[PDB]
Amino acid sequence: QIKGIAASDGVAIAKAYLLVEPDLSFDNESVTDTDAEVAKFNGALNKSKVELTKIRNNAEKQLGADKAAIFDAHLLVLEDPELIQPIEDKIKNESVNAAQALTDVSNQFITIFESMDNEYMAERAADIRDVSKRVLAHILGVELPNPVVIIGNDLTPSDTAQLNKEYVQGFVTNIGSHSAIMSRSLEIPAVGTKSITEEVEAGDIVVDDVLPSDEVIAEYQEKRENFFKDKQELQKLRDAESVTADGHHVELAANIGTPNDLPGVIENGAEGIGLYRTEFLYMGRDQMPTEEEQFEAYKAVLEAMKGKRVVVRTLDIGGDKELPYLDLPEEMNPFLGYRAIRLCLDQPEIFRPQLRALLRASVFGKLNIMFPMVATIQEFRDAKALLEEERANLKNEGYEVADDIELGIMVEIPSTAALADIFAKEVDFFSIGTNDLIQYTMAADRMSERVSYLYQPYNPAILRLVKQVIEASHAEGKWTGMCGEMAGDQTAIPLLLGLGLDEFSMSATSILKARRLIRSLNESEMKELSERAVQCATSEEVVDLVEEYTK
Amino acid sequence: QIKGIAASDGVAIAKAYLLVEPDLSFDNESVTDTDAEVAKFNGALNKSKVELTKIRNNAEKQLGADKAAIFDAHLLVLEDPELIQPIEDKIKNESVNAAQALTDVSNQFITIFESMDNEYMAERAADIRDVSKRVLAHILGVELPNPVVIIGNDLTPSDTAQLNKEYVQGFVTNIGSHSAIMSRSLEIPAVGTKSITEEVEAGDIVVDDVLPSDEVIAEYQEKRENFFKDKQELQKLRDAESVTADGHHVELAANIGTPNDLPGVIENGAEGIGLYRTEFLYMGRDQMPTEEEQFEAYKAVLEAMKGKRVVVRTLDIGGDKELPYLDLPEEMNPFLGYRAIRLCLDQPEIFRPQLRALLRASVFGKLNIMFPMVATIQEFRDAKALLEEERANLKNEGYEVADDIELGIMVEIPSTAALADIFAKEVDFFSIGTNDLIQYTMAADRMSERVSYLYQPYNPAILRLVKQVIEASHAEGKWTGMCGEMAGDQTAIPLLLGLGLDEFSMSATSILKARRLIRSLNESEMKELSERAVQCATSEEVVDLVEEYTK
């Protein structure tokens, strides 16, 4: 029973392996029948060759290709006549046994090859030493490791590969890395010991380190069908609908910041993209991104989502970021200054390329465009007018532009929530960016440590502003989404459901667990939780109410 | 008709003065009756002395005291025998007239005294030259200036004082200072000319520069009874109530930042102090202010207001300010960080001295304590608990502490407005600090130029948050005040009245004009203006509605 119960999964229950290198010690004896001694050596030699030729071929046809070149090198050594002949001649002319004959001759090679200090000649001496050990073991009749719950002294980042990952089930508990690496990589169990070298015999274990009992072999056995159970039923929801137990439907979209995030979107079952952050196109470069370059990236995503909603956020950046082209002064409170839509409306030369590209990409999918940092109705109107201006420009140039592009704002500035009903008439949708709404509403820097205690996503104040935005959009027949981390928060989800949020958008690695929660919930019950939640005074009271309705 | 119609008031209509130095040129003649010529000189000498002795005495008994020492010096010169005798001897022995005799002898003195380069010997030569000119004028029979609408070539910061400020009514239009200074200082009119030296004769003007017409002398005459009319009826409201034409009562308090602001509070008719900023006690020093020092300053004001409400704001400061004692890190967005109540609750060693002093000072007047930057209900509760803790401490030490000290928060963080109804139960009052509420609600730095266009006090969003705070306090039987510049804004006042704000607090120099506006208004009509105002979409629409209801 050791520790280090991490690095990988749990519950293994298999045999063993013990990669401990056997005792290949021998006494330098003298032989009577040298011919027999030479045949003995030649027999171990060939046995080693068929062994290697089996290891090689059975490494490529599994999971090697490039891992199968060390064995061909191992094999090349054994074909070297300048190695074999000296051994045989020693057996004959010196009348010593094969074991020492092999060792003596191979040692000389090891000696000469390491004193060359070449990165390869030291590799050669390493191959000789490695294969010489194989023949020698055959020569002495000692069965050595080769391709169960593996267990070894150290952590070989080369030895742990020979075995077939298939039968290589269970775990691999050593004693402290090269072990904890493939531990989680092979998706197996682990459980960094020390005195594990004296556990069970060669027969044997149970990862989770228990080894055996034959009694409590049922507890962990079903505890395994509890680990795979969750992971399986979870991924099974990949295509399942996002519906509450009582039939209430919601959409679970993903937040991405690059077309490279697309694979994670599909493998998690997102129902669309609620936030396509576009800063990656502008940050880390010396020139602004061209219309054509942005077009390609918007179109790629629109098309890849096959008609699913894709909400692109126009440039949301300010002076606190590098940006060599463009000259943004220092600023005392950048989060309260010249940034996002303020910068874009003030510098249309950086905004037009983005709007033209979006407009052009709109024909390849279901595109929604949202503006960040809008504080006033006139700012939305100016942005929209500029979008319409380039719309007309694109048509007079022959380009096709989708006519039903929904325009919204990302609610983050409190004044925007205070006027929800007014914006709800001119806008097509709202998307609550709680990361910044919490910040501005609590007047606490989302990145500051000294005041992080005021960054309260569950505070009644936040819930109330979220509610008036949602209710304001529904009254005008529109919808409201959320792309702030809150939307993927297990504690917030129950509340958002009750409040009536239409679409939740989050990192792809959260949709599944979120879909699970949403299914095991009653909207009628969540609605009640939210009505009381917005009547609380503190965040703690809100939390207590959520742990209550989600017992 | 010149220009420069500023520097002072308007509408004068008086005589003239023309301080132009007369022509004191004379021809060096020869005299027959030297005795008569000496008596002539002696006659001008004595006439000058009684003239000066009159100027001296009639300078102290008016507005001089320290201005009456130049004349005694002027007089001391004329008593100097080393000056007189040489003149007389010249008249007798050289047989030349007094004019040249005086000039010649005085010149020598001027010569000798200026070549000494002393700051005083040059002052002596200046006195001689100045008084020598007086005798000489008498000697030639030339009436010179002495103590109407003054007019002169230059701007003498010494000549313009001889005349009695009483008869010195009207203005003083020169040609370009030493003129524009006392222009507004004497509260007279002005109207920086150039070719004004050739205006009206010695008889004569009308400041406002018209001079005379005897026809349009009625227009400006009543236009004067329009200037003094406003200024008079305005100060008459010093003791008048702050009531709307239809009987709605409100309080007009003052905002101060030091006991030295007290005189302006009384002379403007403030009905109390709505904001006593306490930063002055902490800024610009190397040690924190002691309890005793703060006590003295709070008590002084409490007592001086004779039972009128005095709302003290606890320390409202953050890292963006010097503050040598205390160590506040750099911070990227200080307005969104460690400051005000956040700093005080985190460093009670700086907060307790302030609360103890306030508690102690409470027995000398009607004190209200309000906390700044409160964002959460728990922050108010923690501040209150700490106040109660020192309350108990002070009583167990023998100090007296008023039991009815009202506790409130300065609403500036949006979350605070979103939860108005909750705070309205635990707090005694609210005081809207619109300077920062506008900033956080519009997410625009109150001090930043590039985004000042978003600092919109009349934006519907701001009006709505103000309204929900006021309505929330009234429902709990409490009151709401406002100390942001908005409360003293002529455009905002009509709206605040309609919204039902109980107390307006502003710089003392605004209460009068504000009281005027409030009186010439119908609350029932203002209430209607506000209901529509909170239904607008833009600031411009709000403004248009105010110019409409205040035609």
UniProtKB/Swiss-Prot annotation, chains A, B:
Signal peptide: none
InterPro entries: PEP-util_enz_mobile_dom, PEP-utilizing_PTS_enzyme, PEP_util_AS, PEP_util_C, PEP_util_CS, Phosphohistidine_dom_sf, PTS_EI, PTS_EI-like
Domain of life: Bacteria
Pfam families, sorted: PEP-utilisers_N, PEP-utilizers, PEP-utilizers_C
Primary localisation category: cytoplasm
Residues noted as binding Mg(2+) in the record, renumbered to the chain: 412, 436
Entry-linked Gene3D superfamilies: Phosphoenolpyruvate-binding domains, Phosphohistidine domain, PtsI, HPr-binding domain
GO MF annotations in UniProt: kinase activity; metal ion binding; phosphoenolpyruvate-protein phosphotransferase activity
EC numbers: 2.7.3.9
Active site residues according to the UniProt entry: 178 (tele-phosphohistidine intermediate), 483 (proton donor)
GO cellular component: cytoplasm
SUPFAM superfamilies: Enzyme I of the PEP:sugar phosphotransferase system HPr-binding (sub)domain, Phosphoenolpyruvate/pyruvate domain, Phosphohistidine domain
Keyword Transferase: yes
PROSITE patterns the UniProt entry points to: PEP_ENZYMES_2, PEP_ENZYMES_PHOS_SITE
Cofactor requirements of the protein: Mg(2+)
Binding site for substrate: 277, 313, 446
Residues where phosphoenolpyruvate binds: 435-436
Domain-level remarks: The N-terminal domain contains the HPr binding site, the central domain the pyrophosphate/phosphate carrier histidine, and the C-terminal domain the pyruvate binding site.
NCBIfam families in the cross-refs: PTS_I_fam
Subunit structure: Homodimer.
Miscellaneous note of the record: The reaction takes place in three steps, mediated by a phosphocarrier histidine residue located on the surface of the central domain. The two first partial reactions are catalyzed at an active site located on the N-terminal domain, and the third partial reaction is catalyzed at an active site located on the C-terminal domain. For catalytic turnover, the central domain swivels from the concave surface of the N-terminal domain to that of the C-terminal domain.
Function: General (non sugar-specific) component of the phosphoenolpyruvate-dependent sugar phosphotransferase system (sugar PTS). This major carbohydrate active-transport system catalyzes the phosphorylation of incoming sugar substrates concomitantly with their translocation across the cell membrane. Enzyme I transfers the phosphoryl group from phosphoenolpyruvate (PEP) to the phosphoryl carrier protein (HPr).
Name this protein carries in UniProt: Phosphoenolpyruvate-protein phosphotransferase
Gene coding for it: ptsI
